[PDB]
Ligand binder design. Structure first.
Ligand SMILES: Nc1ncnc2c1ncn2[C@@H]1O[C@H](COP(=O)(O)OP(=O)(O)O)[C@@H](O)[C@H]1O
Ligand SMILES: Nc1ncnc2c1ncn2[C@@H]1O[C@H](COP(=O)(O)OP(=O)(O)O)[C@@H](O)[C@H]1O
Lengths: 374, 98, 130, 333, 48, 49, 374, 187
């Protein structure tokens, strides 16, 4: 009866979700994009109300430039955040922010100004009564229903692995790798340009992202896949464009996600995601390693590649000792599970102590988020 | 010959991302280029501040490392490159005909 | 290592048997007591280790024994809500002067025989029916 | 109310759920085949890009305009924080120690000022290297100043090394000819060597009895090259040192290399450092366990992640070198 | 439709029955283990 | 994520499968423990004789 | 044969220092880093060479991956040690090692195979006529000039405390703690993330180490310094990156060495260096403690932070009884003290009896080091 | 054992790892009958080595450290202590008694406690005491197989005696004479 509870807002790097607490599915799902008129002032200033947001922005791909206000989990532009947040509050949820608490998510090891700026925007612009900031990986572990395991979360801007044993987090073993789906999009464009299909601008960005989501897969064996793709054409598929032209992907279906495991294709001096998980496990203590082997949890929209779980299990079993067992939990709904975690965490009766109310903000300022959260 | 100026070691993620985007674009379009590091050699780093025109500089501090030159013709920074990518005028921007 | 084998032999047999028989008869008595006290409401416990895991049985037992109102148990099938339900009963015990050692909500949730038996014994000994 | 919840869902969704439960994704099918195709239309055309651009543009033009319920104006509807100010410490006392020493330090430059600043104990004010050379000697050495910014070490430039001038085809032809005056083959850091060419080198060194050292460092070699080299090592009796560092060899390929060691007694140094992916501890255990079998190899360059295999490999190398020492001692006396 | 209704009933019955039969197997196997422990310990006290 | 009721039904099916699998694994480990206990019986009785 | 002068070589975790015996300062000081080609592409600057050793590797950071042959005072890569020793003998001192004796250093509590492999490698690959292995913290006391006191050494790989009374060392009171400059560098990377700056690769590690060597200091009072740093920007200083941009560390300059006094920041449950020294003093007998309190000797490159001496004296004075008198001897040249005492040790006339001959090695194998050395 | 397992490169530092080291000691330590002969045997061959599995799947090899840790019970100079061994302590405690009661004490030596559960402790103790004692006396070491609980078991005997009901420190006596009553009643 607390003004139909709080609102869970999972503002991902490439796409935002919002909804009410206590519900299984988010009410609103739309990309986090701001579209502006590109260079012209034609047709009586066509492109009026110059900020196009969300679905309306991707509707007019040809005549606009699409800018992502979140890059690598860090807010480059704050006006675009508060425009997106205004769109979420008023244009789709259609609820007043004055009577509803807000839950927000962020990357683990982020610059400290982001929390203070989000608190300032929540309390000074939308005057929300209470607000809290959490971590996506802890929400994923909440959504999985387990209190012990290692969580990988890979969105469009950041990948991070955290271990949690018995509800106790280990801050020294938390890792952050800056290799996400945007880099895979750029690599897909690079390998598509060699075939003959050159894709440059933001409309091409949306088209290439759609191609990657609809036609990619993680090969179990890379050299065997190369031999199969060179020998025959059974792996080849066809993708039709919105106008009607049809192209063939072929060899580019499995080379795009392989940069997740071998970053040498992307031009980055880094290890793979499996090495990140293994090194995060080795940084824990001796005894609690085994449970972290038996409770590996995947999350995020990047992990919807087909066959990622079996391949990463094969890699981990190649690295791990042969005595104990390795299993990987890959729920089919994991892309939304972070938001679902919020829908659990705002639903708990004991969480009412943890809200940052306006009265304490009016005495402490935006620095109170360092003491109240985490 | 196109010369792109790259800082191999940098404390800012966005600088490395922009440099890798420029490298990927030159790599995909089969365009021959020179790979020059400003951290590894002081002389080229001093020359790179010296070539660029003053009417578009950063107000505080040294200019950002990703810069494009055509021989000793100065093409531009990452901003003009992204604008030409949007406007499909990249080949004119680098000065390479057609 | 015949003497070490005989020491492990004695350890495996006599201590375990002498603890097991006491544990069995104690839990059989405790089931009868909690069933007699829970029969006023429409509730029954068929297994001491499994029925007290979820937490509704314990909070209803404290409801009937105290005779006095308790907060709403949270509703949900996952582990976290179960931890909440056990924790609220533990807090209610913490208010009325009852002193507990080695008691966590995850101990009751996971199903440790020693700790649930000790909790029921402490309820019988130190708590007041009133 | 399970039945009511299922009735609340669509009946077509219920039939789809029954079909999906019968299908349970596609675990049986391989990774490539488990995806569904998008469309059934055949590929047509060389992908004229301008048609795509023009179609997207007119699609943007003839779109009905979504009108938002509430316009955005950037209105601040909450109380401003307005951070507090402190009364701070308004103290002012003059020390005035000595008319002589007033004028002595009144006109001193900042660079010479920092020396007497550091000798009195304001280590926080300047950098540590500056602070220590201030205390190094009884003279003014400090040139920089406390306010100035610190700069990194430049070290020393390294002259450029001449690129690799070793040609491929003539070297392979001389190897195949069993050339008596070719003993060292260097293939380090060469652009775009074909994999079948490297395999041809691998069978070429099978019958060569005059080349003592080989190196393919930084050639982007892969598992077939490793397999061919592992086959070659059993036949050859002259090759002393094999170098395969900085490559793309997987763990199984390295296992094939170490599995050839018991058969040949002519290799003394093998280096497999800096591979693209870690080999895993199982491969390391096999490597060390059956490298303990071999008694000829003396030098082995690999960084073991675990401690057990590393210790056993070090012990095996110690044993081989001690065998060399013992046979020399027995030969002397 | 109706076929969906018996399909839902069939899946619910199959899952519930699998859970239940696994439950009796584990539970009367636990009975069996307890009897084994009783007799083993007392014969082994005779050894001692 | 299409609807909340879909996720509720999905979680019911997932819970049923998961609980059945857990009971299966517990039954298996109890079986091998039972075999170990029976071997202890046989050895002890032979030693008694 | 007085022309035959031995060579004093200290193999530290970070830097190697080599020189001739009987000299006040080492002739060659250079980091022990092996650089190998990256996998992103071929290098520009080297041909037939496989790797770079020393300052040549340090200068070409942008095309190389850097590896440390010493990990926590343990030689993980023996071929890397052969490369390091070959570079030291042939490229820095420019002398043939066949004609000179060699003196080496070692951490106290090591694997026993370290000395054996070191002796075998030296004798077989360099044909030295005589050699000897000594322990670092005895050489520190030789350099200080007294025969009674406790030595607390902190290098780049390990920290160790040992007491000595009148030249008799007490092996049961030697303590070894795994806390050195590398963990401080990693913590500095982790605490430089929240200001915005990000450092990932090995070249970034060298940059962060260079920042730490010049910007970090030990606070006398941690809470008072924290309040002072939150009060104003007096403590802030600026650094110039090689790219050109200027960073401002601010608060965390005295947070990095605080891990030496509170290891719980790194997540380990060990004690600080002051507690370690006090425990090492308490392990000795009752009578000699009065000397050991008066002659605490600092050493190692890690103890070069300003303000360490007063802080350590304050902590030990808090721990120790009030009657006892405590002073901390911090020589200004302490960074090279482990080398300097070695130059003393090779100069003594008795030490000529203590060398390990080539003949003695020939009969006794590599196990002669345990009987001949301590 | 931690300090001597450092010699092989294995590192254990935390309090949680001390339990692991204690388990290793309980499983894989024994008292050698002759120490120098055992050192020569362990140096000559590798037949004495054993393998242990860590809780995280790592495999370690103890080897020569199996019998060096219990040997510290008989030579306390390994720990830096200047005290005598347990056999010397037992012989000195016998020698402090009167002359007449020594003959019964030599044949009735009893071991107790968990630390005396190392395999081979009884033979070594008997050999050393027989070496110290005069030849005409005979030494018998009594080591019951359940000795780890002997300190409990005798207590369970002592509370069952009839006269021990006259030994208890009652509540009233403590209330009358404070907490210092325990010296008057308990030995
Ligand atoms: N069906 C799919 N198959 C493969 N990849 C997908 C699919 N759907 C989304 N993705 C990938 O997931 C990314 C979106 O991740 P998202 O969940 O939006 O990240 P965030 O955590 O920032 O919200 C896209 O870049 C896309 O590459
Ligand atoms: N001027 C300095 N101020 C603070 N720390 C320093 C300074 N110079 C070196 N260090 C630290 O000391 C380390 C080198 O110590 P070193 O003497 O090489 O140890 P070792 O005993 O292993 O030789 C470096 O990693 C660095 O962190």
């Amino acid at each position: 009866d607390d003004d139909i509870a709080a609102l869970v807002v999972d503002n991902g790097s490439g796409m935002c979700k919002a909804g009410f607490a206590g519900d299984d599915a988010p009410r609103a799902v739309f990309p986090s994009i701001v579209g502006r008129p590109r260079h012209q002032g034609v047709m009586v200033g066509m492109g009026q109300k110059d900020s196009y947001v969300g679905d309306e922005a991707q509707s007019k791909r040809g005549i606009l430039t699409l800018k992502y206000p979140i890059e690598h989990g860090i807010v480059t532009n704050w006006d675009d955040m508060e425009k997106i947040w205004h769109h979420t509050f008023y244009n789709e949820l259609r609820v007043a922010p004055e009577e509803h608490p807000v839950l927000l998510t962020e990357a683990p090891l982020n610059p400290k100004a982001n929390r203070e700026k989000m608190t300032q925007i929540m309390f000074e612009t939308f005057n929300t009564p209470a607000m809290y900031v959490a971590i996506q990986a802890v929400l994923s572990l909440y959504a999985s229903g387990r209190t012990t395991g290692i969580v990988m979360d890979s969105g469009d801007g950041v990948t991070h692995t955290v271990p949690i044993y018995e509800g106790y987090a280990l801050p020294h073993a938390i890792l952050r790798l800056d290799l996400a789906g945007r880099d895979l999009t750029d690599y897909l464009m690079k390998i598509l340009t060699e075939r003959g299909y050159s894709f440059t601008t933001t409309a091409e960005r949306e088209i290439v992202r759609d191609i990657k989501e609809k036609l990619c897969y993680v090969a179990l064996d890379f050299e065997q896949e190369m031999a199969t793709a060179a020998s025959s054409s059974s792996l080849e598929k066809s993708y039709e464009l919105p106008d009607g032209q049809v192209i063939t992907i072929g060899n580019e279906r499995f080379r795009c996600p392989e940069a997740l495991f071998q970053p040498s294709f992307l031009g980055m001096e880094s290890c793979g995601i499996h090495e990140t998980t293994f090194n995060s496990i080795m940084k824990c203590d001796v005894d609690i390693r085994k449970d972290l082997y038996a409770n590996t949890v995947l999350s995020g929209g990047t992990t919807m590649y087909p066959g990622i779980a079996d391949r990463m299990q094969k890699e981990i079993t190649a690295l791990a000792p042969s005595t104990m067992k390795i299993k990987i939990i890959a729920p089919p709904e994991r892309k939304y599970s972070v938001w679902i975690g919020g829908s659990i965490l705002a639903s708990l009766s004991t969480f009412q102590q943890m809200w940052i109310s306006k009265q304490e903000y009016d005495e402490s300022g935006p620095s109170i988020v360092h003491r109240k959260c985490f | 010959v196109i010369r792109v100026f790259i800082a191999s070691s940098s404390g800012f993620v966005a600088i490395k991302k922009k440099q890798q985007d420029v490298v990927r674009f030159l790599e995909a379009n089969k365009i021959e280029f020179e790979e020059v590091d400003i951290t590894m050699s002081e002389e080229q780093r001093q020359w790179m501040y010296k070539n660029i025109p003053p009417e578009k500089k950063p107000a505080q501090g040294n200019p950002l490392p990703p810069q494009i030159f055509n021989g000793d013709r100065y093409c531009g920074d990452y901003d003009s490159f992204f604008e030409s990518k949007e406007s499909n005028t990249v080949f004119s921007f680098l000065g390479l005909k057609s | 290592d015949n003497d070490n084998s005989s020491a492990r032999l004695f350890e495996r047999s006599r201590i375990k048997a002498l603890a097991d028989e006491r544990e069995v008869v104690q839990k059989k008595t405790f089931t009868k007591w909690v069933n007699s006290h829970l029969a006023r409401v429409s509730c029954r416990i068929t297994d001491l280790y499994k029925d007290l895991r979820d937490g509704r049985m314990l909070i209803k037992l404290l409801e009937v024994l105290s005779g006095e109102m308790l907060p709403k148990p949270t509703k949900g099938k996952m582990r976290i809500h179960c931890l909440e339900n056990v924790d609220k009963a533990l807090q209610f015990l913490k208010e009325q002067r009852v002193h507990l050692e080695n008691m966590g909500s995850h101990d009751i949730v996971d199903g440790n025989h020693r700790l649930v038996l000790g909790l029921i014994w402490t309820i019988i000994l130190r708590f007041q029916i009133q | 109310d399970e039945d009511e919840i299922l009735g609340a869902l669509t009946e077509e969704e219920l039939r789809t759920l029954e079909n999906e439960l019968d299908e349970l994704d596609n675990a049986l099918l391989p990774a490539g085949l488990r995806q569904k195709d998008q469309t059934t239309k055949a590929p047509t055309g060389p992908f004229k890009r301008e048609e795509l651009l023009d179609h997207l543009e007119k699609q943007a033009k003839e779109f009905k305009d979504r009108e938002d319920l509430v316009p955005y104006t950037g209105e601040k509807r909450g109380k401003v924080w307005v951070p507090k100010q402190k009364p701070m410490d308004p103290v002012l006392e003059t020390v005035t120690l000595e008319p002589e020493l007033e004028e002595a330090l009144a006109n001193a430059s900042d660079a010479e000022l920092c020396d007497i600043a550091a000798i009195l104990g304001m280590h926080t004010l300047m950098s540590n290297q500056q602070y220590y050379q201030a205390l190094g000697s009884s003279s003014i050495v400090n040139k920089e100043g406390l306010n100035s910014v610190i700069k990194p070490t430049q070290y020393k430039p390294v002259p450029d090394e001449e690129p690799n001038a070793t040609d491929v085809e003539e070297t392979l032809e001389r190897i195949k000819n069993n050339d008596p005056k070719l003993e060292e083959v260097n293939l380090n850091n060469i652009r775009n060597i074909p994999i079948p060419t490297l395999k041809a080198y691998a069978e070429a060194l099978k019958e060569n009895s005059y080349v003592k050292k080989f190196s393919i460092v930084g050639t982007r070699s892969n598992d077939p090259v490793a397999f061919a080299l592992a086959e070659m090592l059993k036949v050859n009796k002259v090759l002393k040192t094999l170098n395969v560092e900085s490559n793309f060899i997987s763990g199984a390929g390295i296992l094939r290399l170490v599995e050839a060691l018991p058969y040949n007694t002519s290799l003394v140094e093998l280096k497999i450092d800096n591979q693209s992916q870690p080999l895993g501890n199982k491969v390391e255990m096999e490597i060390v366990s059956m490298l303990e079998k071999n008694a000829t190899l003396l030098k082995f360059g690999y960084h073991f992640t675990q401690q057990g295999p590393r210790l056993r490999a070090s012990n095996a190398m110690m044993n081989n070198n001690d065998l060399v020492r013992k046979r020399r001692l027995a030969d002397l006396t | 439709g109706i076929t969906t209704i018996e399909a839902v009933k069939r899946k619910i019955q199959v899952l519930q029955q699998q859970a239940d039969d696994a439950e009796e197997r584990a539970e009367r196997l636990q009975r069996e283990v307890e009897g084994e422990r009783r007799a083993r310990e007392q014969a082994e006290a005779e050894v001692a | 994520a299409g609807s909340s009721s879909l996720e509720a039904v999905r979680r019911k099916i997932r819970s049923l499968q998961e609980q059945a699998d857990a009971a299966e694994e517990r039954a298996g480990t109890l079986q091998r423990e039972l075999d170990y206990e029976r071997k202890l019986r046989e050895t002890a009785e032979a030693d008694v004789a």
